[PDB]
Write a structure and sequence with these properties.
Blueprint lengths: L4 E10 L4 H4 L10 E2 L2 H16 L7 E9 L4 E9 L6
Parallel strand pairs: 1-4
Antiparallel strand pairs: 1-2, 3-4
């Protein structure tokens, strides 16, 4: 029943050098429209898959909101940690 719109999104943290390859994945999110959990999960999975491809197989992603209850918006920050390559 969450009817806030997603106002913005960003990726931060430890991106294993792949910041430029991750950033375009955010273009899948529907900004200024109703928030959709599954759109955020899809981005989180894509991030981890891109990072997997360079050897960061234990990468984590945690999506953190910033709510504006006045405007009925939230910003999402995807906090990435690439982890160790292999060992």
């Amino acid at each position: 029943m969450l009817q806030y719109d997603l106002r913005s999104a960003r990726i931060i943290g430890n991106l294993g050098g792949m910041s430029a390859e991750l950033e375009p994945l955010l273009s899948a999110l529907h900004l200024n429209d109703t928030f959709r959990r599954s759109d955020i999960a899809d981005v989180e999975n894509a991030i981890k898959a891109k990072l997997g491809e360079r050897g960061y197989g234990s990468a984590t992603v945690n999506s953190v909101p910033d709510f504006d209850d006045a405007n009925k918006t939230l910003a999402i920050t995807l906090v990435v940690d690439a982890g160790r390559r292999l060992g």
